[PDB]
Amino acid sequence: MLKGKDGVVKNASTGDSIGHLQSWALDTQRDEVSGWGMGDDAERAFTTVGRASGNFEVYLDPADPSDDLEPGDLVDLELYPGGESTGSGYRSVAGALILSTAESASKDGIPMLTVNWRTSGALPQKATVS
Amino acid sequence: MLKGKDGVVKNASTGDSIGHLQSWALDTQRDEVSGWGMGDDAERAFTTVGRASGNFEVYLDPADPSDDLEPGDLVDLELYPGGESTGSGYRSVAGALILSTAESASKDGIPMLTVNWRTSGALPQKATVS
Amino acid sequence: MLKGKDGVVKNASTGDSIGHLQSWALDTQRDEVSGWGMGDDAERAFTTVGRASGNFEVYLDPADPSDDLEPGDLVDLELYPGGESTGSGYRSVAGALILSTAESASKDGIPMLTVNWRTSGALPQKATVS
Amino acid sequence: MLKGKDGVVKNASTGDSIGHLQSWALDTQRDEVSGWGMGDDAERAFTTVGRASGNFEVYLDPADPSDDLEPGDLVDLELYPGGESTGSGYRSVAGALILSTAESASKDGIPMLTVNWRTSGALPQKATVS
Amino acid sequence: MLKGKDGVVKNASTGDSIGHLQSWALDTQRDEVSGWGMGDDAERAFTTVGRASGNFEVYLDPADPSDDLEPGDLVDLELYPGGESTGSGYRSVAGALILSTAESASKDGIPMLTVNWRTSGALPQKATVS
Amino acid sequence: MLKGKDGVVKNASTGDSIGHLQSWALDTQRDEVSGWGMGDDAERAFTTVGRASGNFEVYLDPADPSDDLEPGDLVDLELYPGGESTGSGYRSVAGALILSTAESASKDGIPMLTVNWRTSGALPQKATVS
Amino acid sequence: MLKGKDGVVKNASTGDSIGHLQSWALDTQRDEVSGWGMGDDAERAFTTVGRASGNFEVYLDPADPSDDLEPGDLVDLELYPGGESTGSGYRSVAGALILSTAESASKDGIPMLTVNWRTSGALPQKATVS
Amino acid sequence: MLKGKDGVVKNASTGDSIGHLQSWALDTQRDEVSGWGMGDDAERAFTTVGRASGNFEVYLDPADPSDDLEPGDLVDLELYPGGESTGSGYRSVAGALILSTAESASKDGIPMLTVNWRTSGALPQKATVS
Amino acid sequence: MLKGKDGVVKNASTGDSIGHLQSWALDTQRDEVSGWGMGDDAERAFTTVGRASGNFEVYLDPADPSDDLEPGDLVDLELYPGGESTGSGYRSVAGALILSTAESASKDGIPMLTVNWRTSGALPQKATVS
Amino acid sequence: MLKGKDGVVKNASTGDSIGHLQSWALDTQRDEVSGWGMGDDAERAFTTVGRASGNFEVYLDPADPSDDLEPGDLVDLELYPGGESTGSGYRSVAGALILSTAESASKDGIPMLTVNWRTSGALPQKATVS
Amino acid sequence: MLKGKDGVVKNASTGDSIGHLQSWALDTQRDEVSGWGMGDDAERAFTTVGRASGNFEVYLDPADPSDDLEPGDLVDLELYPGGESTGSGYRSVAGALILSTAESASKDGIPMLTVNWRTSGALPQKATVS
Amino acid sequence: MLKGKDGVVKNASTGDSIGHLQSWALDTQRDEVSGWGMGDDAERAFTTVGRASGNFEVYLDPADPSDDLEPGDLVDLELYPGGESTGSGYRSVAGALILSTAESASKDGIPMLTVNWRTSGALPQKATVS
């Protein structure tokens, strides 16, 4: 049961936390393939190839490392679900591909920014901080 | 009327409970085929081939057997809906295929993990614990 | 205005009530066919062939006749919307085809089971109990 | 502003109110066709052919004229939105085609029935009761 | 900031307000077309042809000018968002094509009517009442 | 953390604030392309071409610069998320293409207007006001 | 506008409906001959000799009169496009020549049979059932 | 822009509309002849002789003037693309030669009939109805 | 209405089912001959000589009796459209000539094999299993 | 990147736009001739003589200059792919030979006309409008 | 049921896998010869001579062994449908004749290459890897 | 795996990129010759002579080097599948013969141009840019 309010995201290439974070997310998939013949009871399957994707939502501030993210950039990410304290696992993604951003606001809210990324060629490598 | 808060899931291959569980689910299907002729009142049907699928949601903790689950792995599962007390039925699935995982968090919550699996070649075999 | 809390479902073949029931449902359809010509005001229609389908949700208990239901089985059903008291209509379905089941649970609930069936060759025959 | 709780539906062929009604509905449509050329500012349209459809929901009671409705029947309907008092408009539909029914219940409710119909060859003819 | 409760709709051809109104709506669109070549950074666009559409919902009363609206009719509309007081802009639509109507009711409500229209050949012409 | 209630939008061509604003929004995308061969573990990707889109919602008033916006117009926009005070970043979009508008009202509300635009040939150019 | 789902085909010689029918078809042709001279504006034509052909597709069942059809057989057919009710026209073909059959199936379908015939010496004689 | 749903076809000889029409079609051709010499840049051409052809598809009904059409008949046709209202052009074909018919049906459709004709000696003469 | 998913094919010479089947097919033909004289209304026909042909598609597995099939082999086949249960008709072909095979695969599929055969000297002999 | 919705076609002889256009097309070809000797690696080629062809599709209206087009006519065409604004290239074809026309309609469409032409003796001469 | 995503192709002469593969295919044929006499029921056949052919599609990369393939080359191929693991059958073709290649691309795709080959003098020799 | 959206085509003679490209394509062939004798098992083959062909599709713009391409011209081409960056292979074709062009448009599209060429005397010479 990790705290959840200690989550830290970093741009690994430049070494700088994101900023006013609100939520993160991650995912992993593999495609399936199913087949069966005339006279079988159950159908078989297997997994071909894998992906990864995720996003995060921050408060919009122009003076942040969150501002430099632009669609099409390649960035090395590190997600700390439980903080940076030693022994806390962190998923590090190499070659993360930023796909789209979406800024918005309301008459009674704070301008928010949603970055949405993807993986390109590599998969999230789990690890344990020292 | 089983308790519901006693549900236990196990990795049958290695023999280790999952961890901080939140909910599980299971399913079974068979495809249908319908036909009728010119001049019939009702249409006929039958079932061809079967499947199974399900998922479960846990609290994210790196030091757990829940962490070793990766998309594409083949694992032997056992679901105890009412606990491990003798005489409690348990659905055991052989060759379960883990298909996708999805980790997430919020600024006021606990990091959660959703594993989502499938069956490959075999179907859930009901039984009764000794 | 039937009571609704007296509803009874039976496996007609073996003669045994289902168990801890939560809700039932039923349906009937007929396909439509519409046509019109160049210079018509309204379009005509008619009904070709009929079906039936429904489901029900029970509390999961292994020691019940609800447990023996498996996808692909053929079972003779009888639905008593208002109980078994004499003069209460009951829809009896012959050759009901059970299509899928879906068991689930939560950390603060009761394990539930949803059976989902269909009709194959026959249609629900209304009647009046003696 | 009609009362709404006085709505009466009738089977015009046999002359018998439906029963414990809960809600009714009606509709009318005409298909559209749009076209434009290279160099036009706005696009033109027109309406080809018309339909009608609707439904109503009643409490399930076997001893009612609502029970005799079966998918595929042809029935002459009359809808009184504001009651049967003189001078109250009523939409009368000839050759209404009943398309599907759907009975259901819950463990804490009343068994309900939803009839769903259509029009075949004719359109709803408004009128004013004497 | 117009009042919103003063909105008036008229049938311009005959000169008669609608009746017990509940809400109106309007819309305008133009289709887009996008293209790009091998080696471009951004994609270009432009707008081809335009439309208009909208609806309104009234209380069902047979003795109203709202009753004469039938699918397929051509009517000249005028929408006064802020009333008929001098200097209040009003969108006047010529050749409005009424496409569908949908009457309904409940056991504890008022019978309502939803008219749904379109434009055919012309576009809404803004203006300012004298 | 920008205030959010100070957001200002301008028509850059004519130099005039919009009016009673309620909310704005913006977006940027780039399409993705994925490929893999027989015998690969992960799938590769890259981004081809980019877009931009957004909208904003105002109170409907005929005597405003918001009224002159018509579908199909080309307008130069400037969005000030945090006001016009010096040092506040503003996204300026050149050649913004207005795509659709949607006016509406209720019996207990204020007539609202939703403008919905797009970009054509250029992308939002961030900057910092002097 | 005949129903289409009432179509009946018969072997007139033995008097037995076909079986589970799916679709029928028929055709009639006459060859053309065109000629023109040096200095003519349009070309002339006429029709020499006529034929007939068609087919039908049934569900494959060995215990049917559909099974006895073999390529090369001569059979007297009668096609009822709208059923056998009195006053319904039926095309009766004498000396129909069955030319080819084609049985097939899939892993998720019903074995189907396509009979394909021709006419030999006579042409389809329309009539009206008594 | 003619309506298209008002198209009327007539047998000019007997004066009777066809019936439930679905679509019509027409055509005109002239053969080409090309030649060139040793040392020319472009090739020359001209048109020798002309034809006409077309078809139409109706719902199959034995009690119609559509039923009397048989391959080999000579019939005088008139096609009204936009109806019979005065001032609407109509292509009248003299000596139309009916070449083939093709009736068909499905288990969920309406029996359709496709007549296919030709011209013999004359060409379609355009005109304007009075 | 045979099940279709129970179809069994056998090599009659060695007595061994094929394997993972996907679909089968069969055919029978006879050539036609048509003639007519100067002054006849319809043309006559008859059938000269017959053939047979078909195929089937299996999943590619080297350890199967499907693997031993090579183009040019002579094999005795038996097709069970509805299984091997007693009373189920089966078409037995003697001297079947295997004509061609075609193996293929995709990056996300299962390697498939299509055998395509013919008959040589004999025709399919229908029968009924004991 | 020309707009495409501004395309204008003209009859150059009489000076009158076509009408409700839907699409145009054009083409140019030259025949090829290939040869090689005993002992050559690649084969040679060259182009002998050229042609041109194209078509266009309009909405059928009798009161248009599109109506006067008849197969066999010689007409001087001018195609403006991007409109008639100054500096817009236009392909002018002299002695265009109209080869065939094809009118058609549907029960839910607009009567369309497809003109199909050719070139005779001359080739399309590109130019630039003043 | 081989995996299908493990398929490996090799140039046997030089010993080097192809590269980014997408799909392969193979085929075998033998010509047929049919004859019959005046007075026979069925027609006889036999197979004369055999061939082989196939292709495969790869991603275009100049730095690959796929690049060295040129039309007219003679290459020794080996196809591993299920990978190179021991006991996996592989079809080895000697003297494969590469017949044609076809490179292509799109504005939103990956440049692909399709090699298309044939056999010359020898036939595919099945085997089993050690 | 080349990007595919970076493809560049050049007119090598004048040194000027084409323009708004959409897709390219290329091909190479060699004819085959097969022979066999009375008493052989497989048939032999070989390749005689080679060709090349391809095309590409661009947006129609008169102010481009794409406009100067005319059927019959001889042009020296260079295709860069992966761009002009150093080390990227490019197929250079000498003496390319342009065979035909085909311009077209729609009422909701962009005027497109398809050039279609051939090779004359030489074959595509692969290379590697410096």
Numbering used by the authors:
A (entry chain G), B (entry chain I), C (entry chain Q), D (entry chain O), E (entry chain M), F (entry chain K), ...: 1 to 130
What does the paper say about this structure?
We recently characterized a novel roseophage, vB_DshS-R4C (R4C), that could infect the Dinoroseobacter shibae DFL12T, a ubiquitous group of Gram-negative α-proteobacteria of the Roseobacter clade. Here, we report the atomic capsid and in-situ structures of the tail machine of the marine siphophage, vB_DshS-R4C (R4C), which infects Roseobacter. The R4C virion, comprising 12 distinct structural protein components, has a unique five-fold vertex of the icosahedral capsid that allows genome delivery. In this study, we use cryo-electron microscopy (cryo-EM) and structure prediction to determine the atomic structure of the phage R4C capsid and the in-situ structure of the tail machinery to characterize the distinguished long rigid tail.
A density map of the tail tube at 3.43 Å resolution was obtained using helical reconstruction. The map showed a spiral architecture with an axial rise of ~40 Å and a twist of 30°. We then solved the atomic model of TTP, finding conservation in the main bodies of TTPs among R4C, SPP1, T4 and RcGTA, with a similar twisted β-sandwich extending a long β-hairpin. The helical tail tube has an outer diameter of ~85 Å and a wide inner corridor of ~43 Å that displays a strong negative electrostatic potential, as observed in other TTPs, and likely facilitates DNA traffic into the host. The aspartate (e.g., D27 and D108) and glutamate (e.g., E32 and E57) residues lining the tunnel form a negatively charged, almost parallel helical track through the tail tube, equidistant spacing of ~16 Å. Given that this value is close to the mean spacing of DNA minor and major grooves, we speculate that DNA becomes confined between the tracks and can therefore migrate quickly along the right-handed helical trajectory due to the electrostatic repulsion during DNA translocation. The inter-monomer interactions within the same TTP disc are dominated by backbone hydrogen bonds between the β-sheet layers, with two electrostatic networks for assisted binding. Specifically, β5 of one TTP interacts with β2 from the adjacent subunit, forming an anti-parallel β-sheet and an extensive hydrogen-bonding network. This results in an integrated 24-stranded β-barrel structure for one tail tube disc. Interactions between layers involve extensive hydrophobic interactions, with the long loop of TTP in the upper layer interacting with three TTPs from the lower layers of disc.
